[PDB]
Amino acid sequence: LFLLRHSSLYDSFYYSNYVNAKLSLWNENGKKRLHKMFARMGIPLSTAQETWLYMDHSIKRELGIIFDKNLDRYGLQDIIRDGFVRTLGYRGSISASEFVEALTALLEVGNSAQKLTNLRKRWVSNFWLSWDALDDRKVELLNRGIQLAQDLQRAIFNTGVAILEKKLIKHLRIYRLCVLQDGPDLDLYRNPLTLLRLGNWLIECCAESEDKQLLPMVLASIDENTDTYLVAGLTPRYPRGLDTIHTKKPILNNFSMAFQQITAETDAKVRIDNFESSIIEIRREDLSPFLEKLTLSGLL
Amino acid sequence: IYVSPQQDFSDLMKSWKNERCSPELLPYPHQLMKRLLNRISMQSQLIENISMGNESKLPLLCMETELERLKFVIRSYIRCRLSKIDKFSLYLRQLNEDENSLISLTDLLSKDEIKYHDTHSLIWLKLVNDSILKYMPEELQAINDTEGSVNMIDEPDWNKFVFIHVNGPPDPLLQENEFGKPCYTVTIPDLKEEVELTIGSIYVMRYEVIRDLLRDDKVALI
Amino acid sequence: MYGDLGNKLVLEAKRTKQLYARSNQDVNLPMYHEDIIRNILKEVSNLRKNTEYLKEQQQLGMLDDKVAKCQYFVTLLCMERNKRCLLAYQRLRTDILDSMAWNNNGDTNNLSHQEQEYLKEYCDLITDLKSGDLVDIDLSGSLVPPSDVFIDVRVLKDAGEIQTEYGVFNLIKDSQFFVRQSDVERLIQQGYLQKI
Amino acid sequence: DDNTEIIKSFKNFILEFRLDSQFIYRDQLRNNILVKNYSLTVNMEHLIGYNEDIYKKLSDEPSDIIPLFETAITQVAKRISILSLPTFQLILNSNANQIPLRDLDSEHVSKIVRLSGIIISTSVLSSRATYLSIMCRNCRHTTSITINNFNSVSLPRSCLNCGPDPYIIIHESSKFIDQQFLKLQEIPELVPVGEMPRNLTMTCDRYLTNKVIPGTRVTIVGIYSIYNSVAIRTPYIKILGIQSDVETSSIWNSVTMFTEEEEEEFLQLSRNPKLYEILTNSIAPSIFGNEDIKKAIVCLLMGGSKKILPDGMRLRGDINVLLLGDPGTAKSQLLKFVEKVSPIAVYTSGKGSSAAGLTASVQRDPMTREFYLEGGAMVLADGGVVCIDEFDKMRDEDRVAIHEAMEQQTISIAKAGITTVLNSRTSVLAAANPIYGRYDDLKSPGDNIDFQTTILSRFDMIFIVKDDHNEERDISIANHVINIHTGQEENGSEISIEKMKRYITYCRLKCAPRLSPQAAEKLSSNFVTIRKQLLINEESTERSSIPITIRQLEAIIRITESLAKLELSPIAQERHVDEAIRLFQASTMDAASQ
Amino acid sequence: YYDIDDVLADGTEFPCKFQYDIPGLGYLENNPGRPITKNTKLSLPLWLARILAIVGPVPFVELLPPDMFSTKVMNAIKTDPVALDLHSINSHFFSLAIKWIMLFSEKELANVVSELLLQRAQELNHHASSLSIDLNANIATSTFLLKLEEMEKEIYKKSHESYKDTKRWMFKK
Amino acid sequence: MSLPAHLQQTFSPEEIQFIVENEPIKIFPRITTRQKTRWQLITTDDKALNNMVAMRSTEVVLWIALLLKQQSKCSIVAPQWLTTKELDRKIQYEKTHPDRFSELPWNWLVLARILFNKAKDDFHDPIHELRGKIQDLREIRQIKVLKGLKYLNESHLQLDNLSLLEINELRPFITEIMDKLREIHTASL
Ligand SMILES: Nc1ncnc2c1ncn2[C@@H]1O[C@H](COP(=O)(O)OP(=O)(O)OP(=O)(O)O)[C@@H](O)[C@H]1O
Ligand SMILES: [Mg+2]
Numbered sequence A: 001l002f003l004l005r006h007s008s009l010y011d012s013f014y015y016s017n018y019v020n021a022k023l024s025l026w027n028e029n030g031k032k033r034l035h036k037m038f039a040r041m042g043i044p045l046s047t048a049q050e051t052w053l054y055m056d057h058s059i060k061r062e063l064g065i066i067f068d069k070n071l072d073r074y075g076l077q078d079i080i081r082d083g084f085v086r087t088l089g090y091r092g093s094i095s096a097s098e099f100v101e102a103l104t105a106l107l108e109v110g111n112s113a114q115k116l117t118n119l120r121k122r123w124v125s126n127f128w129l130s131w132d133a134l135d136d137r138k139v140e141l142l143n144r145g146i147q148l149a150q151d152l153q154r155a156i157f158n159t160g161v162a163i164l165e166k167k168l169i170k171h172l173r174i175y176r177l178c179v180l181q182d183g184p185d186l187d188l189y190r191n192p193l194t195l196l197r198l199g200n201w202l203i204e205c206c207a208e209s210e211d212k213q214l215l216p217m218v219l220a221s222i223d224e225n226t227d228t229y230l231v232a233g234l235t236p237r238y239p240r241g242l243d244t245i246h247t248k249k250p251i252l253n254n255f256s257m258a259f260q261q262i263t264a265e266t267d268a269k270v271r272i273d274n275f276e277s278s279i280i281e282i283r284r285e286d287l288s289p290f291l292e293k294l295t296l297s298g299l300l
Numbered sequence B: 001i002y003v004s005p006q007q008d009f010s011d012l013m014k015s016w017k018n019e020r021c022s023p024e025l026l027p028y029p030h031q032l033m034k035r036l037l038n039r040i041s042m043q044s045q046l047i048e049n050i051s052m053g054n055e056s057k058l059p060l061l062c063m064e065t066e067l068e069r070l071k072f073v074i075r076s077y078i079r080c081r082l083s084k085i086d087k088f089s090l091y092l093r094q095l096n097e098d099e100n101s102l103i104s105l106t107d108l109l110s111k112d113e114i115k116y117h118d119t120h121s122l123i124w125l126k127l128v129n130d131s132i133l134k135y136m137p138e139e140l141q142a143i144n145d146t147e148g149s150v151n152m153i154d155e156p157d158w159n160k161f162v163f164i165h166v167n168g169p170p171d172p173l174l175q176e177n178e179f180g181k182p183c184y185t186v187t188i189p190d191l192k193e194e195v196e197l198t199i200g201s202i203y204v205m206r207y208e209v210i211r212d213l214l215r216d217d218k219v220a221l222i
Numbered sequence C: 001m002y003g004d005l006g007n008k009l010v011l012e013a014k015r016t017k018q019l020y021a022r023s024n025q026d027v028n029l030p031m032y033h034e035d036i037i038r039n040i041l042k043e044v045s046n047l048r049k050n051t052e053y054l055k056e057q058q059q060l061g062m063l064d065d066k067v068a069k070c071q072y073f074v075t076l077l078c079m080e081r082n083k084r085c086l087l088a089y090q091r092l093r094t095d096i097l098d099s100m101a102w103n104n105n106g107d108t109n110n111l112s113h114q115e116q117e118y119l120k121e122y123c124d125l126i127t128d129l130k131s132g133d134l135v136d137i138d139l140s141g142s143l144v145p146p147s148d149v150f151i152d153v154r155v156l157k158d159a160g161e162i163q164t165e166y167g168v169f170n171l172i173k174d175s176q177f178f179v180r181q182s183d184v185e186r187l188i189q190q191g192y193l194q195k196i
Numbered sequence D: 001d002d003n004t005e006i007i008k009s010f011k012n013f014i015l016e017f018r019l020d021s022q023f024i025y026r027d028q029l030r031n032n033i034l035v036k037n038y039s040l041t042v043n044m045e046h047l048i049g050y051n052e053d054i055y056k057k058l059s060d061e062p063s064d065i066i067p068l069f070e071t072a073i074t075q076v077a078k079r080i081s082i083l084s085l086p087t088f089q090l091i092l093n094s095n096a097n098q099i100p101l102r103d104l105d106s107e108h109v110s111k112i113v114r115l116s117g118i119i120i121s122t123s124v125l126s127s128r129a130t131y132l133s134i135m136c137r138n139c140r141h142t143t144s145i146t147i148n149n150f151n152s153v154s155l156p157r158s159c160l161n162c163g164p165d166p167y168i169i170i171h172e173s174s175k176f177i178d179q180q181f182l183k184l185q186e187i188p189e190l191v192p193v194g195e196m197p198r199n200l201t202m203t204c205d206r207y208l209t210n211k212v213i214p215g216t217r218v219t220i221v222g223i224y225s226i227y228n229s230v231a232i233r234t235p236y237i238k239i240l241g242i243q244s245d246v247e248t249s250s251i252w253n254s255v256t257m258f259t260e261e262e263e264e265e266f267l268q269l270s271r272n273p274k275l276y277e278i279l280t281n282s283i284a285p286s287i288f289g290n291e292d293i294k295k296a297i298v299c300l301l302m303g304g305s306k307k308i309l310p311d312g313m314r315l316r317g318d319i320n321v322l323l324l325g326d327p328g329t330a331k332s333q334l335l336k337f338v339e340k341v342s343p344i345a346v347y348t349s350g351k352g353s354s355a356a357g358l359t360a361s362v363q364r365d366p367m368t369r370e371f372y373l374e375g376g377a378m379v380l381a382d383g384g385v386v387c388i389d390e391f392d393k394m395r396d397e398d399r400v401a402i403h404e405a406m407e408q409q410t411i412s413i414a415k416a417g418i419t420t421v422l423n424s425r426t427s428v429l430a431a432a433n434p435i436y437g438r439y440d441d442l443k444s445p446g447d448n449i450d451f452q453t454t455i456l457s458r459f460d461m462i463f464i465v466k467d468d469h470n471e472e473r474d475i476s477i478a479n480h481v482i483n484i485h486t487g488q489e490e491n492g493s494e495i496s497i498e499k500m501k502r503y504i505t506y507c508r509l510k511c512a513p514r515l516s517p518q519a520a521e522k523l524s525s526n527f528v529t530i531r532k533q534l535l536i537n538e539e540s541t542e543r544s545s546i547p548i549t550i551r552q553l554e555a556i557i558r559i560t561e562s563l564a565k566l567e568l569s570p571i572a573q574e575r576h577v578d579e580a581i582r583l584f585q586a587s588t589m590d591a592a593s594q
Numbered sequence E: 001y002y003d004i005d006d007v008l009a010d011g012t013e014f015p016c017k018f019q020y021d022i023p024g025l026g027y028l029e030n031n032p033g034r035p036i037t038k039n040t041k042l043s044l045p046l047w048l049a050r051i052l053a054i055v056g057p058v059p060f061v062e063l064l065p066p067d068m069f070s071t072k073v074m075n076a077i078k079t080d081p082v083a084l085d086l087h088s089i090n091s092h093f094f095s096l097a098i099k100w101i102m103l104f105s106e107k108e109l110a111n112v113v114s115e116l117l118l119q120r121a122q123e124l125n126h127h128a129s130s131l132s133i134d135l136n137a138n139i140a141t142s143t144f145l146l147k148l149e150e151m152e153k154e155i156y157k158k159s160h161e162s163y164k165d166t167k168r169w170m171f172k173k
Numbered sequence F: 001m002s003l004p005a006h007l008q009q010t011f012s013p014e015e016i017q018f019i020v021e022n023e024p025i026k027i028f029p030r031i032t033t034r035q036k037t038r039w040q041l042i043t044t045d046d047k048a049l050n051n052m053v054a055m056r057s058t059e060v061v062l063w064i065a066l067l068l069k070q071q072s073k074c075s076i077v078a079p080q081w082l083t084t085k086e087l088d089r090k091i092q093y094e095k096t097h098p099d100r101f102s103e104l105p106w107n108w109l110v111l112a113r114i115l116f117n118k119a120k121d122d123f124h125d126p127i128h129e130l131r132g133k134i135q136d137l138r139e140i141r142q143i144k145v146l147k148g149l150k151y152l153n154e155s156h157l158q159l160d161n162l163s164l165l166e167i168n169e170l171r172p173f174i175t176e177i178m179d180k181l182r183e184i185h186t187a188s189l
């Protein structure tokens, strides 16, 4: 669940990739199913939306049993897991996943060639906010990171809702394709990490499920201040928590090789300077020929 | 009388504390400061010689830290002295202008302090003469007039209240009290009082009455 | 009356002193109040004219001793008051300039020509003092006692590979160093680095 | 038994809590005792962190547990302050979800709840009993009673033969505290569909009294209890903590409340070389153009300086602005933004207003049969801005009641044996339309304005806004509105509403500039020139409908003083005089020339 | 001599009464260039008043009792030193009182002023010691601060800064 | 001028700490410097450091001790007065005598802070108990200081056993108030 200990239980179930994937919370049916689940668990809606600290202690203590008996009905049996929780005297307790989420949020939104250099300088600066958050004396930074993580997850959820409602995810035999052109929050997706977050959200939702053959996904975004794309190849994922011989085997990311070969053969002034070779920057005009060549290559 | 570097450092610390907490400008320890500067030079040369040439890493760090501490102490002492000289330039000049006075700035100040005093006095006098003084009549053209409505020479606050700690001799002036503890007796002329200072006790006295004991090193400003 | 202009100038001096006290790190002296000082000097000249006229009247006139004494005393006291106000204002400004000079190792449009010359000469004097037997010490150094030998610092403003006496520090913006406080103390003083 | 253990647990919490190396509550208690502030503010998150059982006990039965906490606080204070003091007050802070005022029902009885609303009425301080000294009529037996103000106490029914109720209170030996009653309404945005706003009765004690003024949004933490005025109980709220976004203490007192870190943030902002542009851009960011009107609104918010002469004559220091324009000019939106940003403001409609609504109303108490005076928008908005929308719609009778308020800044009432002169130091921002709904250039200005000159002279600046159909401006406005609909600089080019409100309060409470002789000379020259031009512009057919009197000179002086105050400058120079003159020429002379 | 507050204190106006007929001293009076008759009552700055009073047999001027050292003010000081608002009475009250005492060699005013200063310094130290704490991360303090004289303000600032620095050093992480 | 205004007539807390770190302290060396390079210090004595044996009590300067502790080459022996029993005895002495101050070391506050921040595992007793005891002692001494501040006069004043940090904190207020009282009395004569 997303930041269970620093938000409400309703928010924790709502803004979770796995819960949305297994319930489709991006439409009204998913919300109705979630409300029905909460009603059968015996937790009032007002109680669920209460913050974690002030939630009724009886329900908080019984939460483990309540989940043990009710999550199986709705297919959320995988929510049960064992993690590491760290506490300091007279302070709140924070789990490892929540700490990592706060650090990533600080890294992402913490606060021609010239603009690119300025953006990369800003990211380098955010690195130091993330570094400072690792200290026990700087807890205000951690709280700020938690709030930014909540906001970023909300924005990514809105963008994913927009993508899925419009049916923007074109399906080609070799691979899937999704291109963002006129979203409300296009600026947030200049950072590769936010784009990867959105890509993971989309991969878990409606793709990990539906019993559809695994297919690599292409996610692209556009920034008007520079008029270029940020293409990011994403490897497919097996259903979460499904131990199997084929699930035991890993899935490799072949997009770096195909992108490099296309760039070398073609002439579109593509950038492969990023460490993650699957993320490239493409000029506005060249994306259509690049995708044509990608489809015709068949090396994905 | 040279004894050992530790005693020199202790005396330097005592002088620094007294200068920081004292109202007046105390006499300069010429010999002690010369010894300290020479020792700093030799120690810096020794550190350089050792460094130029892993068990020896920690000692070198200790030497460098010690050198930095000593340099900071000397720097703070000298800067406080310079500020005091700034505040009493006219006083100090008046001291020097008088011949009956026993004190002379050569004993009361070092050569660097004398040069700084003279240069700053000349510069400030030039500024105020080119700005203001040249327009006033001859009667008001003196930067240091003591016969005016308000005296222009700022003397030290002799009766300033300071904290002291009585330590005793490192004693004709020493005498015992009723309770069998050693004590000192000082008088306050204005109030016609007698104050009994007990060794090892902290007091808040006027500087003038404790001046002799402080000079003799029987008490130390906290 | 006569001392109102001087009183206003001293009020402005008090305002400047309060501004200096309130300011944390950055202090910029206000503009030299040339007009008020000009008016004060004109008033002093008028008082001098009054004194000369009184003396001439006493030389040849019907003025008596008591009237002459009282008028002369009043004029002299007014001149003393104006002189005191001017000197207090100038001394406060000079003290602030002195602190500024010591803050540096050794805009100006607000200063007057006399104040600019004074600042230049004082900086020269500070350098001369630093050139003497106190060369081993750096008089214009930090007044905070040394506490930690090694500290973490972060680059605040980009700069090339500045070659300091202690070593070469390629100050790339947003990069941390684990170095001695003494070596990079000056860089922190100028604002290139930060202790964090 | 259990009470002693609860008190011990609270004492241990007070004496042992620490998040790094400062005992927060111990030091806070010592500091509060130093300044004779017998109270203690406790953050509930810290209580939860220290021990969840204590929080559970506190939440289960607040009315029975809080007094034990107060006793523990008193004991710790005595230990920490006296070397071997009335009962201390407990003020709570929490971040729990706010319950809508209308959602408060039976389910929330005798529980700690957090809610926000608007204060509409406050009562006069009363006296409660804490320590009572009593004596029996017959045998004269001395006894004492200790009373806590939390209600789930009476004089003994039986003496300790004596008849029923034999004890009589001795007053000179008793101790009392302060009590106040407040009326809290629900926020307009939170009201359900087609329902009148709901009122709630609330009470505060000791250090929570005289903390809020009517018309200010507040957040309240308290206990949802009930009192029997036969099968029903009247609900009410027992206030435990008040949190408001307006420093009421600094508004009704010459005293000013601002942290050192605040004072130094507002000085740095004032030091900005171009603060005027930042504030002009910070007002109505969603409205295109209207820069001059935004500057006028800035001047109105800042206000001028008021002078009281030795002879007793008082000079107004508030700036009034009128907006006469065509439909679609965004005047009402500007009025709403002004009401939102000003520290104190009331938004009223001329149509839906009355003489007694906008000044003060004689009201008879139902019980005492005595007449009292309630207050209206110009008493509730004292020290702020009154936004009178639809100014033109107002009846003559109603309108005429505003003159003294605007000019003399007082309200004179002689009704039902009540003879008093109230204080209304307010600024009026009004919007209106011409007679025919548009400013027809064919007809004379006199025919386009039904306002008598007497009311118009009081407005410092009059803006005649005419909608001109220009293709470029139309395209720009359409693009701006489309971007607004389909769609945060905060890079020094604009400051949020809260910061602007705080800066306005600080500037008003800190600076009151004065004109220099050069400013006075320039202003006199400009006034002579303007009056001469107005005299020349006169036509034999009609006399100028827009007036130019001494009030306009005073208005220009006020604008200059407000401009100087904007930068915390003690003196106003010719630089501000030029801007004030430009604004006057752009608005009032522009209206008059047409 | 160069201390700003001392210069301001000497500029305050004190009542005076001339004892001689001095033609040509009208500029001190409201009107310029007219003779000033004896016994005329006017207010002069302290710097001119003191010297004229001491110098001048019958001196030139007689210093009348000011309004800042009147029976009403003394009674208020004795009744409630802490609640008394000294700023409205004068912003340099202690400096002017010390100057007046030095001028007139009187002990009653000295005793009253000493008692007032001690009783005010008690509350001054209380307020200076009182420091704020940020739980998430007044009225009486400001009410008393509005009543302080300039010297008391300086002492308060010094003590408050010392306390703040000590607390910061103690609780530095 | 040369010296800032806040450093005039008083010491900053950092200066008080610097003064404190010149005092000796006992340590347990975790290395064997003694032979069966060489420290050559000019401010303190270097004989002790050279003749240092493992797990043998030796005396060195506090700042040198902290420098060694940073390298985990010496365990600082906490002062005897910094035990729970001794602090309790001092609290009892303070409570029984409301007129005097307990005979605590002149550097107890500064040394306690330094040792708590730098040497946390060296203490035999729990740190929180020591912090609570120190806090209680500080409040009692503050009460005594407030009670004793009522006797300021133009003549002398005695504050026995008061520590260095408290004197540094109180120097401005006490000094200025007594100076003004003396000025008034002098003017009276
Ligand atoms: N420049 C502008 N920028 C943005 N919105 C505008 C602008 N001008 C007008 N509007 C919009 O036009 C509408 C006009 O309504 P509004 O109540 O603000 O008008 P008004 O000027 O008060 O006119 P009326 O006299 O008819 O009451 C509002 O939605 C306002 O948002
Ligand atoms: Mg409208």
Ligand SMILES: [Zn+2]
Residues within 6 Å of the ligand: D136, D137, D138, D139, D140, D141, D159, D160, D161, D162, D166
């Ligand atoms: Zn009875």
